[PDB]
């Protein structure tokens, strides 16, 4: 694990449109802030509704018919995503610091597991960008068929604050690879990766206005985005809440496709016959994972009634071994919540928790006195109807439930409007097989938990989202289908 | 053409749940007119909020884990729909004339072009029950991960007035074949030919609750549909203005899976090259198909200066051939439009059209005592900005453009926020191919029109759709891709 | 189990060309014999070199650009598959007492799961149709690429006496589907099944010339086939002994396709933690059925050194069970070898086995005065070493081997040139991964055996085949990539 | 067009096993040859069945379950691959001079197309490595199946010296982003650049024996990699004679699989309607690439009447505008033939010309006092039985045939034992379509030829060869299809 050997100097805080920095329409400004000290780290230019058709309208003009990214080569718009991993794996020290300073992530995760799967991300994408096919077709009567998958246009993506650099790659990548222009809104809470990244697309030598970065509020930018009548598809992911206000704009304006990845209450299984020892690890890493700010966190665990009070002791065991601090110091293993809100959304659920009847094994409170740190908590004998059961907390919050009988178990396991990802711990070939295909839910681990890799599809089923990022499956909903038919004289087999 | 050698009486009229038929919870029932002669034909059940509830019980209740549609063979789920294909062709001739009588629909077309469609359309989608595959994917680490295509759920389907038995099949076909259970909700205007379809589906022994068909207006039982809290996806063909309320409310309730196909104004382009009896046989049954009431309808031509007088002249001759009648009748080549709504809609477009200075060529105006028949209209030097150039007729009437510039009719084509099809009418290799690739449209047909066939995808660009219905890429918006990966103790190649 | 109330006559016995019946151009006849019984069952024509060439010829013909095969829609040779499927249905009672009467099949088995495994597989072929797609390509420069699949050409099929209706529609299945035209050349031993489907083959309504039917002797009709100049495709089922003459041939020829499914000496695995019984069944189908004329048959059981006795013993008593006799008459469960040839060579390795120290469970002899029947036999204490443990037998004679060591036992079951099948038996997720990632075999059932449906691909590593029947995949080896290229003036992606 | 500063050293002379240099078993050695000079460039390791049977032991070792290639994940085989391709552009002056200076080509297409080809076609064959995916399959019954797509084995690769950097990657990309282990032999006339690639696999660091050269000749190392009895599939390009040889030997040691490409007499049909100057100047450079050295060379142009005089001006205008001399000296526009066997075989064939009366335009003989030069050459007046017709040169020498009809061009170009590749010009859509659908060739490009790219699959129809290379579909043939099949309680759609 290297380091950087100079303290972080920000330079990138402007709106990208054009391979060019932009002032606000409006001269606005908004502060950035350190959650471990809570501290200004820079100021950033504010976009709004006058800065995205700004930026809209430079995308638009890039996607015209004739233009250089539309006449290039397939395999040279893999070239520039290729080139674009290369120079983020050049300045991966620096944007691992900005990642862990800004975004309040340990720096060790920041920098062996978000820029590896960022630059892995990027490279999966640029192998695709000439291999994405359409099909001949035996049509009946005289006819040639044939599909190009063709890029959409115009494409709006949205960023949440939990993974601010590799939730940029699974929505740029995959976008770029099929030949779209894109309008980006990172979160108000981190622009600065983004920003960044901004710099080194111009370097890469992408043309002008295919990518434009606008960062902005929520209600503001990210509202003109969802609205805007020539953006042809938004791409958000965030919270279930403002999943419906996106979902309900593009309706209301221009019927834009709509991409979204929505918050999660994630079950794991463990049966009796599970490798208890495996299963207490994997169960722990997936709730307590950056801060419990992962909208996969394992937030039910239910493990059979035979070996139920010995996890929760393991459990408990290995909750306690945290070490809170500034993500950047050495030797520190767990780092701060984003900000304000959510650390008081945090707080008040462990407290209907214990009030509800829960029972508090370890933590239940805040720590220090600045940052926005909470102690790591363990609930055991939770029941379905509890608060803790039923709500995201997005917090290190781990609750753990008892059941006997696996009809039942899958019954609880399915009783939300949420589906995002699933666990299953057996030794069994059937119960692995029967427990993944009974269970409602995007992915599911059996014997592990948080395996995300570019190679598979990741989404939700029912209110965690609307199709499927990254895998072959993820670039077809940045592709259009076209369907040409052609009249011959006499059709030969 | 053979034909009913018995005056059709209607016998299904009624809501159709767990194979079984119901009557309305209120009591309700609504007339059904025969558009011709302006006559009830019967009364159905109407359907509202309390009567969908009651069928997406009964169809949540048949894709629980466990039942006989989720236990049965993907191969046994093709046999009974190829089973319904069978029953259909038998019941040929009266689903023909219950079409015709009840749509407005002449005979011969919906004898051998919207039964046949249906026919092949069904026997298609059979074929693909057992051959739905997904991945298995060579993910990083020590993992085995494989994909799951799953059906998504109880489906929510719309069906429109314009093709009410070929549209029905089109949304069960691949909804039943990727193993969904379905709620329908059928026009209000042309019931008819889905509850018939109904009693097929309990004769071919499909389980019960599979298929449920709740007869209904847009308003009431069409909104409780889309803002259903247990409905997982919702198809809807019709109008861009409802489609905007469709995905508005799925946005608002449990971001339910919207797809919709939608209105047209599709443009033809002539070029000089051209072989202009073939350009205006097909630019011609492009538009005046079904009496204009497609959404596909060739609604623009534009016809290169050199040869544009010979085809507005050529056009006119083949427009005053038309006989005009009720379309069960032998001899009669055009039937009325669907309702009064409609029909006050396409003469008040048609005044727009000669007011705003375009030239009336033929017709341009009402025929008949009874009946909601239009004369049809041709209009030659009518200009981008007149409504008759901007918004769907959907009625018999026929605009005719002038240009010089391919650029500029390209740009002129694609200036539209509808983008359904498009028509290019030419004999150069390097034309066929770069206007197809120019052209925003979903379908581009060169050197024909309105051909369409279950092997190929159909749906829009921009505000004429979401998704795509039929061929291989069709089956997708019908599945859900669960990933499921395994921890293994060492991978091998 | 339904039966045929009527003695079978046998009606269709001469070469089958251009959907006439043909004598042979010398005039010979070779006798068909019941194996129950040795008695001759009837005279059947002698196709040889000259008969070959004249349904090559035949099959050319109908194979020409603008001939009524080529021209037929994909949709259209989809519906001839389907309607064959139904008259093989409605065939059903005749075709399985002839395979059972001709093949010495039980009757049983031939009936429930011989047709119902022709039948499914027909109708899964016609579904591939319409549905074989190729590609859009996004090449590098100003270009338009795509490729056909298209049809390979005439195709000359070998079927195996083992299976003959089945294998029979396991190659013209996927080859008719696809496009191609075929000649047939069906087992010495059993011509008849394939014959009667010649018959349906023209009541389907097929073409004439799409399918010949040349029955004969393998060095003659099978040599011409296989040195044709002409033929464009040959398959072939058998021993691996005549599929080393056949693709020798082809390269000396005319560089036809080759594919091949040839023998087996397939191992199962049961290890400790295995359900016990579950395997002892599996692994006893697995080698008895049909006598053990599997290419797949189960004839290396490696059981782990803790559970080896116990299976022994429960192996043994399964064996014993046995009634042969007329594979027609009610109750018996075990019918006759084919021929001479086969029962002698698998009383010769029996013999072998007692020789070179294999212990005798049960069973080592023949039974009966008339027909070649073989009492089931059983091996313990079977090594590597034995002609019982490294040739194929292809009788009913089972061989239990022990282990110890996982790693040794997946090397001893990989210690062959073979490679068509394996079975693992285990409770354990890892176990089952791991083992069928690590054995080199084509098919690997995991705690079953024999499971072969139309979905899924079949075939060989090593020296077992080359290339794959069924499924997806087994239609790439019909047809033939076409690539095209056409220049045009700009791309536009 | 950069040039190398120095005069080249060649420094790779030996047989590569093992990243380890080695002498061959025998001590013998074999001279190289500039073919521009006949002067020896150095002496190479001449490689035998001993060599062979090394080198094959060492990837089958590389090729074990548990092994370093076939335990690393499917995306770091892509990287070494990506890391590959870096390394060739790094060397691409001295490769691209020793490609000119030992293979005869001029130097400007060594450099600016084949090394380009190189590094494109590695680059996207690395993008497949983690993207080759099987399936999961709906069976009938209570099982899930998947297949793997599993590599094959050790494959063994027979590069000729027509191409030799350029078909080397063809043959190593996708072996090796399939994850096989490979023993290549290259061409006894041009051995050093594979030699010097060599150098690059060891530096890439690819584990040892995954790629293990053997120079030598054919009758020998080449017979030893086709008759070898643990080499799983043998690629071979070259002369349809020794493809016969290789499949031969194939089919009477282990049933390797085996594909070949082999040579061409491709037609270019050339309509009136044509662009003609475009036609005359792709058909030109159709056939004078590399000196003719192109299995895919435009050796029989079809032009219709009306226009065949112009054409055969024009082409003979351009066809004496070359400049002959050493490749390596600015302003050559023609380099020599391979070797003396080639060069006599040429001349050979242009005596019969002259001889069965076809009309010599220009050349016709040979130039210069060393090196292999012919003087390039056309014919016109060809009639279809003159051997010029019929038996492929591989020399610069063009023939160009007179047609009226369609129908009977198409039946003369089809009639060939050959089928590599066809052009078609034409203005006209229905001709390109119909006219590609017609020609039995594996490639048609119409209105431009040999237009060759990484993305598009390759290959013959007839004996022009067996299989694919290059796109999607050239994957297929280095992957092996394992189905796997578990028995589980109870399945669930
Ligand atoms: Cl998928
Ligand atoms: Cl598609
Ligand atoms: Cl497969
Ligand atoms: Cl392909």
Same mark, same amino acid.
């Given at each position: 694990?290297?380091?950087?050997?100079?303290?972080?100097?920000?330079?990138?805080?402007?709106?990208?449109?054009?391979?060019?920095?932009?002032?606000?329409?409006?001269?606005?400004?908004?502060?950035?802030?350190?959650?471990?000290?809570?501290?200004?780290?820079?100021?950033?230019?504010?976009?709004?509704?006058?800065?995205?058709?700004?930026? *809209?309208?430079? &995308?638009?003009?890039?996607?015209?018919?004739?233009?250089?990214?539309?006449?290039?080569?397939?395999?040279?718009?893999?070239?520039?995503?290729?080139?674009?991993?290369? =120079?983020?794996?050049?300045?991966?020290?620096?944007? &691992?610091?900005?990642?862990?300073?800004?975004?309040?992530?340990?720096?060790?995760?920041?920098?062996?597991?978000?820029?590896?799967?960022?630059?892995?991300?990027?490279?999966?994408?640029?192998?695709?960008?000439?291999?994405?096919?359409?099909?001949?077709?035996?049509?009946?009567?005289? %006819? %040639?068929?044939?599909?190009?998958?063709?890029?959409?246009?115009?494409?709006?993506?949205?960023?949440?604050?939990?993974?601010?650099?590799?939730?940029?790659?699974?929505?740029?990548?995959?976008?770029?690879?099929?030949?779209?222009?894109?309008?980006?809104?990172?979160?108000?809470?981190?622009? =600065?990766?983004?920003?960044?990244?901004?710099?080194?697309?111009?370097?890469?030598?992408?043309?002008?206005?295919?990518?434009?970065?606008?960062?902005?509020?929520?209600?503001?930018?990210?509202?003109?985005?969802?609205?805007?009548?020539?953006?042809?598809?938004?791409?958000?992911?965030?919270?279930?809440?403002?999943?419906?206000?996106?979902?309900?704009?593009?309706?209301?304006?221009?019927?834009?496709?709509?991409?979204?990845?929505?918050?999660?209450?994630?079950?794991?299984?463990?049966?009796?016959?599970?490798?208890?020892?495996?299963? *207490?690890?994997?169960?722990?890493?997936?709730?307590?994972?950056?801060?419990?700010?992962?909208?996969?966190?394992?937030?039910?665990? %239910?493990?059979?009634?035979?070996?139920?009070?010995?996890?929760?002791?393991?459990?408990?065991?290995?909750?306690?071994?945290?070490?809170?601090?500034?993500?950047?110091?050495?030797?520190?293993?767990?780092?701060?919540?984003?900000?304000?809100?959510?650390?008081?959304?945090?707080?008040? =659920?462990?407290?209907?928790?214990?009030?509800?009847?829960?029972?508090?094994?370890?933590?239940?409170?805040?720590?220090?006195?600045?940052?926005?740190?909470?102690?790591?908590?363990?609930?055991?004998?939770?029941?379905?109807?509890?608060?803790?059961?039923?709500?995201?907390?997005?917090?290190?919050?781990?609750?753990?439930?008892?059941?006997?009988?696996?009809?039942?178990?899958?019954?609880?396991?399915?009783?939300?409007?949420?589906?995002?990802?699933?666990? *299953?711990?057996?030794?069994?070939?059937?119960?692995?097989?029967?427990?993944?295909?009974?269970?409602?839910?995007?992915?599911?681990?059996?014997?592990?938990?948080? *395996?995300?890799?570019?190679?598979?599809?990741?989404?939700?089923?029912?209110?965690?989202?609307?199709?499927?990022?990254?895998?072959?499956?993820?670039?077809?909903?940045?592709?259009?289908?076209?369907?040409?038919?052609?009249?011959?004289?006499?059709?030969?087999?």
């Amino acid at each position: 694990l290297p380091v950087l050997l100079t303290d972080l100097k920000i330079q990138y805080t402007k709106i990208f449109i054009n391979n060019e920095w932009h002032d606000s329409v409006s001269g606005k400004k908004f502060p950035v802030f350190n959650p471990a000290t809570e501290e200004e780290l820079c100021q950033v230019e504010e976009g709004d509704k006058e800065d995205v058709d700004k930026a *809209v309208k430079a &995308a638009r003009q890039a996607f015209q018919i004739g233009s250089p990214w539309r006449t290039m080569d397939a395999s040279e718009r893999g070239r520039l995503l290729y080139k674009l991993a290369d =120079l983020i794996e050049r300045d991966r020290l620096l944007l &691992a610091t900005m990642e862990s300073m800004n975004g309040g992530k340990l720096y060790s995760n920041a920098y062996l597991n978000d820029l590896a799967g960022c630059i892995k991300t990027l490279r999966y994408c640029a192998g695709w960008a000439d291999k994405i096919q359409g099909r001949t077709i035996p049509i009946d009567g005289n %006819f %040639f068929t044939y599909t190009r998958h063709e890029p959409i246009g115009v494409c709006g993506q949205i960023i949440p604050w939990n993974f601010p650099l590799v939730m940029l790659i699974w929505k740029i990548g995959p976008a770029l690879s099929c030949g779209n222009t894109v309008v980006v809104k990172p979160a108000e809470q981190t622009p =600065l990766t983004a920003l960044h990244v901004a710099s080194l697309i111009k370097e890469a030598g992408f043309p002008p206005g295919v990518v434009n970065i606008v960062p902005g509020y929520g209600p503001t930018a990210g509202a003109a985005i969802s609205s805007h009548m020539d953006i042809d598809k938004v791409a958000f992911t965030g919270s279930t809440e403002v999943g419906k206000l996106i979902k309900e704009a593009a309706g209301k304006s221009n019927l834009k496709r709509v991409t979204l990845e929505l918050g999660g209450k994630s079950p794991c299984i463990v049966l009796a016959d599970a490798d208890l020892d495996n299963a *207490v690890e994997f169960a722990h890493h997936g709730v307590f994972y950056h801060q419990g700010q992962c909208c996969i966190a394992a937030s039910r665990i %239910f493990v059979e009634e035979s070996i139920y009070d010995e996890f929760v002791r393991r459990s408990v065991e290995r909750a306690k071994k945290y070490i809170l601090g500034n993500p950047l110091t050495p030797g520190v293993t767990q780092g701060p919540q984003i900000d304000k809100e959510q650390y008081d959304k945090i707080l008040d =659920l462990i407290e209907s928790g214990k009030k509800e009847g829960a029972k508090l094994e370890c933590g239940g409170g805040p720590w220090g006195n600045k940052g926005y740190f909470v102690q790591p908590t363990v609930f055991s004998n939770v029941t379905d109807e509890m608060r803790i059961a039923k709500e995201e907390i997005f917090g290190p919050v781990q609750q753990i439930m008892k059941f006997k009988s696996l009809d039942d178990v899958i019954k609880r396991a399915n009783n939300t409007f949420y589906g995002l990802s699933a666990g *299953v711990f057996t030794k069994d070939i059937d119960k692995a097989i029967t427990i993944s295909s009974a269970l409602q839910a995007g992915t599911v681990w059996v014997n592990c938990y948080g *395996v995300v890799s570019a190679q598979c599809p990741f989404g939700g089923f029912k209110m965690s989202g609307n199709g499927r990022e990254l895998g072959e499956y993820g670039f077809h909903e940045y592709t259009e289908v076209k369907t040409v038919t052609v009249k011959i004289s006499q059709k030969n087999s």
